């Protein structure tokens, strides 16, 4: 991805040999920057609504004629708007992004009838998985605001048209916008973005209201969608060693109908539960999470105790083989993340919008057994353990028990 600048907008493109191009606009407008709860999710759902030059309806009818597709999502850091199309249709897609950023008519009826209903179904579908809920609740406990804001719009806190209009005034601005083109000729993109996004406001960098704070605690969410539990450990010093740690600890099976050789995978033996170690680097802070979902709350309780033990065992001693396996699993994870268009866009988006140079999968550091033991020991000795039970919370473990 050759980083450049076109009319004040950061543009990164990588040419390829395929008939299919992906163009993504990455916006610094994720939930950590949200003025009001849910506004970044609503803004994401407001992309490709009526603009002054082109109605939502006309856009969709024309997108179908090009056979293009549209993907949008919100993270804690970004809003990502992606289009996939045939190489030659690039100018149309650049112009459509420009119309969205400069000329979105934010009409009340679109919010009531189109945008908010779609945002609500989006959230209900995600929450069908209790593991999603548990990991969201864990961020809320650990950070409270900023990173602790909900990513998604909820019913209890309504977003108004004035909220979304204000936030869009901040976000849709040259300072908060990065363009990422996969299988796009870099010189052609720069020329097009330079003409289309020239009249976009400059604006200023969106910032998180307040400094990121680290907290501990519990989050009991009584649902009936299933049972899950996140054992989260908030990290004040984001380090790449936790990537190898998450990979090592593992949880998911490497092959069909197996359990997996990973410590966390060998804590589910005998039960019908599923574990997953995940590290969430957020630049200024971090979050190490072990999410156990399953049908039986008793089964989850068992695995949860084995999970914390596994972390302590790592803190004691990792073998050289285990350290090599962590490197291999972590290199592979990096590679596939840089391949997947959703995550690829945000990786370069982070490099362009912040200045955090991407770590190429081939440059992923090998951590010694000593380094991995150090990492796990720091997590075992965290003074702020966060627990987030979802489901039959009366039968799920508490922070003090673990």
């Amino acid at each position: 991805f050759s980083t450049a600048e076109a009319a004040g907008v950061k543009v990164a493109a990588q040419d390829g040999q395929s008939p299919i191009s992906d163009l993504s606009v990455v916006l610094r407008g994720g939930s950590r920057y949200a003025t009001v709860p849910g506004v970044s999710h609503i803004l994401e759902k407001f992309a490709f609504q009526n603009t002054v030059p082109k109605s939502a309806l006309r856009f969709v009818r024309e997108l179908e004629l090009f056979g293009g597709k549209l993907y949008t999502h919100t993270t804690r850091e970004h809003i990502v708007l992606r289009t996939q199309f045939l190489k030659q249709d690039l100018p149309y897609f650049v112009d459509a992004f420009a119309n969205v950023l400069k000329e979105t008519k934010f009409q009340q009826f679109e919010l009531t009838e189109r945008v908010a209903p779609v945002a609500e179904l989006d959230l209900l579908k995600r929450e069908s998985d209790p593991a999603f809920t548990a990991l969201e609740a864990a961020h809320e406990v650990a950070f409270r605001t900023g990173l602790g804001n909900s990513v998604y719009a909820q019913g209890y806190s309504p977003v108004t048209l004035e909220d979304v209009k204000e936030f869009a005034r901040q976000v849709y601005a040259k300072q908060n916008v990065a363009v990422v083109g996969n299988n796009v000729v870099p010189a052609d993109l720069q020329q097009l973005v330079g003409t289309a996004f020239a009249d976009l406001q400059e604006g200023s960098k969106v910032t998180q209201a307040g400094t990121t704070t680290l907290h501990g605690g519990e989050a009991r969410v009584r649902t009936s969608t299933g049972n899950a539990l996140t054992i989260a450990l908030p990290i004040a010093e984001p380090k790449p060693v936790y990537h190898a740690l998450a990979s090592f600890l593992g949880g998911p099976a490497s092959m069909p109908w197996s359990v997996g050789a990973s410590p966390l995978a060998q804590a589910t033996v005998g039960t019908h539960t599923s574990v997953k170690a995940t590290y969430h680097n957020y630049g200024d802070a971090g979050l190490f999470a072990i999410t156990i979902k399953g049908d039986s709350p008793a089964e989850i309780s068992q695995v949860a105790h084995k999970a914390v033990q596994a972390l302590k065992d790592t803190g004691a001693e990792v073998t050289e083989e285990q350290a090599a396996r962590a490197y291999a699993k972590s290199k592979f994870a990096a590679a596939e993340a840089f391949e997947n268009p959703d995550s690829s866009a945000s990786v370069i988006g982070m490099e362009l919008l912040s200045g955090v140079s991407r770590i190429a999968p081939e440059n992923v550091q090998k951590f010694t057994p000593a380094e991995l033991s150090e990492a796990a020991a720091q997590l075992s000795a965290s003074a702020k353990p966060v627990v987030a039970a979802v489901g039959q919370v009366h039968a799920l473990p508490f922070a003090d028990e673990l």
Partner: protein
């Protein structure tokens, strides 16, 4: 590089356009035949129908040329 999709709006009225209607033209034709055959069949008994239409059809037309003998006719 393609800047714009390439299309026109065809003329239309009450949600009908010429390409669609043109597909149905032959169907209206057959329905018209059906209605014609049906109508003619319904009035086949009417003497004028026989005199003016049916008796003039070649070969077949003699089916409708029938005379009551003067000896058998009170009127």
């Amino acid at each position: 590089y393609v800047k714009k999709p390439s299309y026109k709006i065809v003329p239309h009225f009450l949600g009908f356009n010429i390409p669609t209607v043109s597909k149905w033209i032959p169907i209206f034709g057959i329905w018209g035949a059906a209605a014609g055959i049906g109508a003619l069949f319904l009035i086949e008994g009417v003497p004028r129908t026989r005199q003016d239409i049916l008796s003039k059809i070649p070969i077949i037309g003699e089916h409708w040329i029938r005379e009551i003998p003067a000896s058998d006719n009170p009127f």
